[PDB]
Design a protein around this ligand. Structure first.
Ligand SMILES: CCCCCCCCCCCCCC(=O)SCCNC(=O)CCNC(=O)[C@H](O)C(C)(C)COP(=O)(O)OP(=O)(O)OC[C@H]1O[C@@H](n2cnc3c(N)ncnc32)[C@H](O)[C@@H]1OP(=O)(O)O
Ligand SMILES: CC(C)Cc1ccc2nn(C)cc2c1NS(=O)(=O)c1ccc(CCCCC2CCN(C)CC2)cc1
Length: 411
C-alpha cells in the first residue's frame, strides 16, 4: 500500500518491471500547456520558496536542514553532513534551472521545513544492449532503439523533511511540486536514487567501504576492537598493519587535473561511460564543473604520459556526523566519483585514489558497486556496508539491469 506511489507513473511491482523489454515513457504524452501554471496548494502556514544558490545565506539554510535532518544509516550511527561548498557545487551545475530547487518555509519565522532539488542531466537511457539484440532478431530493432539518443532529463536529489514534520505526507507534496516545475520546462523523465526500496528500482547495488584510518573507525563503529581482531589476541597494531597504505602515489605521471586536461578527460571518460547501458553524457563545461579540483569538495588526478592523459580518477568529500558520540564528531569520507583507465589495471589506478585520500586525511573511502567498482573490491580490501543504493526512473519503463550496467554516479 503506497497511497502516493500507486498514483504515479512508475512500475508498481518487481514483476511488472521484470517483464519490461523496451525503454519508453509510461504516461500518455502531455504538453507544457497541460500543466498547472500555479504552484501546488499547501497549508497557509507554509509557503513555497525557491532558494538562491548564489546566496550564501540560502545555502546556509539548506545546509543546516540537511545537517540535522538528512540521511542516516539504518542504525542511526551516521548522518550525511554535506558542506556548504559541496551543496553549491552539486546544486549549480552548468545550465541548472533555479526553479527546480524547491523549498517549503514556515510563513512566520521563514524557517526551512523541507527541500527537494532537481538538476539537469543528459542521460543515455535507451533499451539495454542485451534486450536490444534480442529485439533486433525478432524484427523489433527499431522499437528497441527508438530512445537511444541521450535525453535531457532531471536528476532529483536532497529530498528532506524536518524531523518535527515527518509522516505528515509532506514528501509527496514536494515531489508533486517538483514534478510540476520540471514538466513546465518540458522535461518528462527523472532519475533518482534512494537507500530505501520504493516502486520500483531498475538497478540496485551494495555500498562498499575501505578504512583509511582504522584507529578512528574502530573507536567509532564498535566502539572497541572488532570481531576477529580482539580474537586471535593482538588488535590495533594488527588493524593498522592490515589497512596501511603507501605515503605517496605509485603511478609516476600522476598529478592533479588542470583546466587544459578537460578535453582529454572528457574523451576518455565518454569512451568508457558509453559501454554502460545507463550513463551520463557530459560537455566540456560539465567535465570542468564536476571534475576540476575544488577545495574540500572534489579531488581529481590524471595519469599523464608524454603530455597525454591516459587515465584519471576523482573522489568527492561527504563528512558524516557521528551520531551517538562524545570523542569524534565527524567521519571524513571520500566517495569514488568518475574514473577511466586505459594504460593500467583499474585496481592499480584506484590504489592511488586510496593513497591520495589517505594522505589528505580521509578516514574511509566509500562507493557503490556501479561502473567497474566490483573489479577492485577484494584486492583493495573494501568490505560491503549495510547500505544499498537503488536506482529509479520517473515516467520511464526500463528492464531490470545489474548495477554493473550503470554509470551515473549520484552525489
Ligand atoms: C518529471 C519529473 C519528476 C521528478 C520527480 C521524480 C520523483 C522523485 C522522488 C523522490 C526522490 C528522492 C531522492 C532522495 O533524495 S533519497 C533521500 C531521501 N531523504 C532522506 O532520507 C532524508 C531523511 N528522511 C526524510 O527526510 C524523510 O523521511 C523523507 C523526506 C524521505 C520522507 O518523508 P516522510 O518520512 O516524512 O514521509 P511522508 O509522510 O512525507 O511521505 C510518505 C511517502 O513518501 C515516500 N518516501 C519515503 N521516502 C522516500 C524517498 N526517499 N523517496 C521517495 N519517496 C519516499 C513513502 O513511500 C510515502 O509514500 P507512499 O508509499 O504512501 O506511497
Ligand atoms: C562507517 C563507514 C565504514 C561507512 C559509512 C560512512 C559514512 C556514512 N554516512 N552514512 C549516512 C552512512 C555511512 C556509512 N555506511 S554505508 O554502508 O556505506 C552506507 C552509506 C550510505 C547509506 C545511505 C543510503 C543512501 C542515501 C542516498 C541518498 C541520495 N543520494 C544521491 C545518495 C545516497 C547507508 C549506508
Amino acid at each position: 500500500a503506497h497511497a502516493f506511489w500507486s498514483t504515479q507513473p512508475v512500475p508498481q511491482t518487481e514483476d511488472e518491471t521484470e517483464k519490461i523489454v523496451f525503454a519508453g515513457p509510461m504516461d500518455e504524452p502531455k504538453t507544457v500547456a497541460d500543466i498547472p501554471e500555479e504552484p501546488y496548494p499547501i497549508a497557509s502556514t507554509f509557503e513555497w520558496w525557491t532558494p538562491n544558490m548564489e546566496a550564501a545565506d540560502d545555502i546556509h539554510a539548506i545546509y543546516e536542514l540537511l545537517r540535522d535532518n538528512y540521511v542516516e544509516d539504518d542504525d542511526s550511527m551516521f548522518r550525511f553532513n554535506y558542506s556548504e561548498e559541496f551543496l553549491q557545487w552539486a546544486l549549480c551545475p552548468p545550465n541548472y534551472i533555479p526553479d527546480w530547487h524547491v523549498a517549503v518555509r514556515r510563513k512566520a519565522d521563514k524557517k526551512l521545513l523541507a527541500f527537494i532539488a532537481g538538476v539537469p542531466v543528459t542521460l543515455r537511457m535507451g533499451t539495454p544492449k542485451y534486450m536490444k539484440v534480442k529485439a533486433q532478431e525478432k524484427g523489433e530493432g527499431e522499437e528497441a532503439a527508438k530512445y537511444d539518443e541521450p535525453r535531457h532529463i532531471c536528476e532529483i536529489n536532497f529530498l528532506c523533511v524536518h524531523k518535527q514534520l515527518r509522516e505528515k505526507r509532506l514528501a509527496p507534496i514536494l515531489i508533486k511540486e517538483a514534478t510540476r516545475r520540471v514538466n513546465r520546462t518540458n522535461v518528462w523523465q527523472a532519475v533518482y536514487t534512494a537507500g530505501v526500496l520504493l516502486p520500483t528500482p531498475y538497478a540496485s547495488g551494495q555500498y562498499f567501504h575501505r578504512s583509511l584510518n582504522p584507529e578512528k573507525l574502530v573507536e567509532i563503529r564498535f566502539a572497541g576492537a572488532p570481531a576477529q581482531y580482539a580474537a586471535f589476541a593482538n588488535p590495533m597494531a594488527m588493524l593498522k598493519r592490515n589497512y596501511q597504505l603507501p605515503s605517496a602515489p605509485k603511478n609516476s605521471g600522476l598529478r592533479e587535473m588542470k583546466p587544459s586536461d578537460v578535453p582529454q578527460v572528457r574523451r576518455i571518460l565518454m569512451n568508457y561511460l558509453d559501454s554502460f547501458d545507463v550513463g551520463p553524457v557530459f560537455s566540456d563545461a560539465e567535465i570542468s564543473h564536476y571534475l576540476l579540483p575544488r577545495d574540500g569538495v572534489v579531488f581529481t588526478y590524471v595519469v599523464e604520459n608524454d603530455k597525454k592523459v591516459t587515465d584519471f580518477f576523482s573522489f568527492y568529500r561527504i563528512p558524516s556526523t557521528v551520531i551517538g558520540n562524545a570523542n569524534y564528531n565527524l567521519l571524513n569520507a571520500a566517495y569514488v566519483h568518475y574514473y577511466a583507465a586505459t594504460s593500467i589495471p583499474l585496481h592499480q589506478l584506484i590504489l592511488d585514489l586510496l593513497i591520495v585520500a589517505h594522505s589528505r586525511g580521509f578516514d574511509v573511502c566509500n562507493m557503490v558497486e556501479i561502473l567497474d567498482n566490483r573489479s577492485f573490491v577484494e584486492q583493495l580490501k573494501f568490505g560491503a556496508g549495510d547500505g544499498h543504493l537503488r536506482y529509479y526512473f520517473y515516467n520511464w519503463a526500463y528492464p531490470k539491469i545489474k548495477p554493473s550496467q550503470v554509470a551515473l554516479v549520484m552525489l
